[PDB]
Structure 1
Amino acid sequence: GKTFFGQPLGLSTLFMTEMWERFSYYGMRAILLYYMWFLISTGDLHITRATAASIMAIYASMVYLSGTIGGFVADRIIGARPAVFWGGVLIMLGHIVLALPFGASALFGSIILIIIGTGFLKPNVSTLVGTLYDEHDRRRDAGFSIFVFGINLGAFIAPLIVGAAQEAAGYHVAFSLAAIGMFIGLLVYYFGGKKTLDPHYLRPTDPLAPEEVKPLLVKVSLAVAGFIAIIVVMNLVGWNSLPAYINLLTIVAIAIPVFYFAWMISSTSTEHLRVVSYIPLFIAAVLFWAIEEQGSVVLATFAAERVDSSWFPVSWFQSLNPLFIMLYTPFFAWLWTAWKKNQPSSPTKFAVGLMFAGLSFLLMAIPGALYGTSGKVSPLWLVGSWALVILGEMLISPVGLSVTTKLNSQMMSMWFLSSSVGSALNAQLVTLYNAKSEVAYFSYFGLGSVVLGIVLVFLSKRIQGL
């Protein structure tokens, strides 16, 4: 009868829920870097612009890492529906914290709230989408495709609205708009959810058995103690600068997949050989996400310093990324179906995807080389870059989780960890970007990325077999 684009009505609630949460997230991202610059310019915030960029990168990295944990907490301890709700409350608080007349002092509280909040909400709204379908219901793919379109929608309009607001009424009003975005999300989620969602997901679906509670408690406490202990030693030997902490978070984010790789490989020999073949794919994913995650940092810097954008808010460039996702998506949907005969392998898609990413940086090296780096250049250079990298994303992401799974639960999380690892790498790399290094930065990381894409093409055939 009455459906939401063919799908159960309950999909409309989750569609809107995520649309507004993503609105709140990307509205904030579009101006947070400029906000840190602002706070630097007034002497309120005592860091370099390069450190500000580094913060942006490690922030994303922690958001993605947080998300690989929220599923477990909801499944085992609090339930999917409460996770989404309190996750949204924490996200809203994080934005409210930035709307207050405080300054640089609120930055950390804001960041922690949103890292925890997002990590609760984000995997669990996906989970709730799945629960709308019987599991042999073929509509499922369509429904997720629709859900994703809502995600891209929020990411698309947020910089336009929040950025304009920032221009009209300043940073605190613009951040309050992100808060209101999340609030709307919660409103629709709460009341819409009660009508359409199974009450079963009010509770955990795999609750802790009595003998499971102690070891989990022991597990968590040790990790905290260690982490605290590392921070203590760090300060005793004088490694207590913001860059040092960012470095520590970088190490933790890299170590997690490195430890997992070291585990599987050490610990079925043919099962082993498939795991070793994934390492090239994982590296490729990491490098790809790095370049893509620099849209909000390095391309954002470029947009503000090198582009003549005197007639519109420079944060609007952050809308090109989800615009191109939305434009490309129904195309590539049609493409794979039409292309039945000799479809490229998922490892081949990874390689070519990395090349396009690499091309997107190589493109950006041209205006500096041709025109110099002291003037301003056309907005279209950036438009071409995002067009190139998102073309890369269409090849890598839709097959990404697929390639990892067919090659367990730790490996499954490893795909979602590639975007965290890429951002952690960025936290180091983006500090190398400035006006003097511009052309070398784009060239080097552009070319290297294309080369590794070439290497992966050579390696593609053996991985296909496995």
Structure 2
Amino acid sequence: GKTFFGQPLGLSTLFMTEMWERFSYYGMRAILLYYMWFLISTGDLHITRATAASIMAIYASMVYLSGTIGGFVADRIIGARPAVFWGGVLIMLGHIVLALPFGASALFGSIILIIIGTGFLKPNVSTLVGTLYDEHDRRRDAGFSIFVFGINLGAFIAPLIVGAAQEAAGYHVAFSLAAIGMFIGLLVYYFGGKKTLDPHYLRPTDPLAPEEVKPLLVKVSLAVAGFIAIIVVMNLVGWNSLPAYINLLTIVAIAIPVFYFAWMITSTEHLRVVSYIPLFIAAVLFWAIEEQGSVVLATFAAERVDSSWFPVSWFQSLNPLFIMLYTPFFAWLWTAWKKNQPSSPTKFAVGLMFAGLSFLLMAIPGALYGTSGKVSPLWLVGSWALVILGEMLISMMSMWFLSSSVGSALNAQLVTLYNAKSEVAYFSYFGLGSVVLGIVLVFLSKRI
């Protein structure tokens, strides 16, 4: 009987749905930094390029922090399938905002819409993939691997299409393509879902009991009130610049796992929770480096590379391209390698060392040739080749979204240090540091 690569046919609907959402997200991000550079260049947007880079990082951080509660809201309040649909709608609207004939004034509205939308859609589209399978089913992990391939499929073709469109017909048109991408995702999702998805997930699977409603409301109200109080105080004391607000979001993002871990810490349980701290840190630092590809490596692509024969935003395709290219091998690897299939911590250790190697490699062209000229595109190609080796090793949903969010929050401060005069030191020191405490994670690995 017909399947989608051996899997239930529903996977095809969810495959394409996420491929097109990821298309809209990554197509937009492959030109967003350049768009801000452009807005700065015309005097419309009053920030430094450093701050612009910082915005890209905290933006990514908020997008995944939002997903850490998206699952809850679907499971307990609105249902997984409506979460994805209305999430998709909010994302489309976010891209439409940028297609409108506005400038810097439209940036915030776009960002908020996409942050909220992605929080609803991403964890729940992934959750729905699981719903295709009985828990007894063995295909389940193959199904997600296919799903992830779809994620990177969209991530791969989006910069090629949106970037080319930007150079040809301008930014607004290019952003409109992203919106259209999400629109296409919603169409397939809506009509394909009705044919192939369980109507069980039109509603929340664990709806709030009567006595649970008021305490939840109290809880979120106190969080919103406290957050609002801090912003009030910040303006009183004069800490009300954009970087001040970015610093606030950074702190909140990092305070969450810290606050979390610190007071969940019988004696044995205590330690095994403490056992996952270094692995959480490993994921955070790895995703820090991985997410810098769209910021620092994007900057390097635009400023330090001779690629005058194609849109520089196309370098953003190398990351998911390598994912797709590496997948057949690692499929072969994990089967064929049966004994000594290594510690989940070790996969984290090595994965971080590779990330560290990817940056160390980028320290070389400036050390050898200087930083005022331009170097071969192959440095970036080699750099992404290394960091994606790590990502192959690295692959609750919330925690996963959380490690990423903290990584990008860290980036929001780090990437402000990058410039052509810091380049070599920047790459070398953050590169070495990552290798070193990926090695430190080897000393500790089995001590765990």
Deviates more, 1:190-199 or 1:426-435: 190-199
Query: Which residue number corresponds to residue 117 of structure 2?
Result: 117
Regions of 4+ moved over 2 Å:
341-344, 410-416
1:451 and 2:436 aligned: yes
**Cα separation, 2, equivalents of 1:440 and 1:62:** 28
How far apart are residue 250 of structure 1 and its match?
0.2
Deviation of the 1:334 alpha carbon: 1.6
Whole-Å Cα distance in 1 between the matches of residues 72 and 141 of structure 2?
A: 23
Match of 1:277 among 239, 261, 275: 275
- Length-normalised TM-score, structure 1: 0.95
In structure 2, how many angstroms separate the alpha carbons of the residues matched to 1:270 and 1:290?
A: 31
Distance 2:130 2:398 in 1: 18
SS of the equivalent of 1:388 reads helix
CA deviation string 1:390-415 (max 9, x = no partner): 0011112xxxxxxxxxxxxx976333
How much does 1:341 deviate? 2.3
**Aligned partner of residue 361 in structure 2, secondary structure:** helix
Residue by residue, what CA displacement relative to the aligned partner does 1:307-333 show, whole Å, maximum 9, x if unpaired? 011110000000000001111112112
Equivalent residue for 1:23?
23
Structure 1 CA distance for aligned equivalents of residues 178 and 341 of structure 2: 42
Task: Give the drift of 1:416.
Answer: 2.6
Decide whether aligned partners of structure 1 residues 230 and 31 sit closer, same or farther in structure 2, where only a CA change above 3 A counts.
same
Is the contact made by 2:68 and 2:397 (CA closer than 8 Å) also made in structure 1?
A: no
How far is 1:10 from its partner?
Answer: 1.4
Aligned to 1:61: 61
Query: How many Å apart are 1:385 and its aligned residue?
Result: 0.3
Distance 2:291 2:50 in 1: 16
Give yes or no for the alignment of 1:205 onto 2:205.
yes
- In the TM superposition, 1:13-412 aligns within 5 A as 13-265=13-265, 268-396=266-394
Residue 444 of structure 1, CA deviation: 0.5
Alignment CA distance shift 1:412-1:159 (3 Å): closer
- Measure, in 1, the Cα distance between the counterparts of 2:382 and 2:267: 45
Can you list the C-alpha shifts for 1:344-365, whole angstroms capped at 9, x where unaligned? 2111111111111000000000
Choose from 405, 420, 426 the match for 1:435.
420
Deviation at 1:439, TM superposition (A): 0.4
Unaligned runs of 5+ in 2: none
Moved more, 436-445 or 134-143: 134-143
Distance across 2 between alignment mates of 1:195 and 1:413 = 29
| Partner Cα distance (1:443, 1:197) in 2 | 49
Deviation per CA, 1:148-189, whole angstroms, max 9, x where unpaired? 111110000000000000011000000000000000000000
TM-score (norm 2): 0.99
In the TM superposition, what whole-angstrom CA distance separates every residue of 1:50-91 from its partner, at most 9, and x where no partner exists?
000000000000011001110000000000110000000000
Distance 2:31 2:229 in 1: 35
Distance in 1, Cα, partners of 2:400 & 2:100: 37
Distance 2:444 2:129 in 1: 37
Please say if residues 123 and 397 of structure 2, whose CA atoms lie closer than 8 Å, have aligned partners that are also in contact.
no
Cα 1:415–1:13, aligned 2, differ >3 Å: closer, same or farther?
Answer: closer
Q: CA deviation at 1:294?
A: 0.1
Q: Report the alpha carbon displacement of residue 284 of structure 1 after superposing the two structures with TM.
A: 1.2
Q: Quick one: distance in 2 between partners of 1:151 and 1:165?
A: 21
Q: CA RMSD in A?
A: 1.3
Moved more, 220-229 or 275-284: 275-284
- Worse-matched range after superposition: 26-35 or 325-334: 325-334
Report the Cα offset of residue 279 of structure 1: 1.6
Contact (CA 8 Å) 2:371, 2:420: kept in 1 or not?
yes
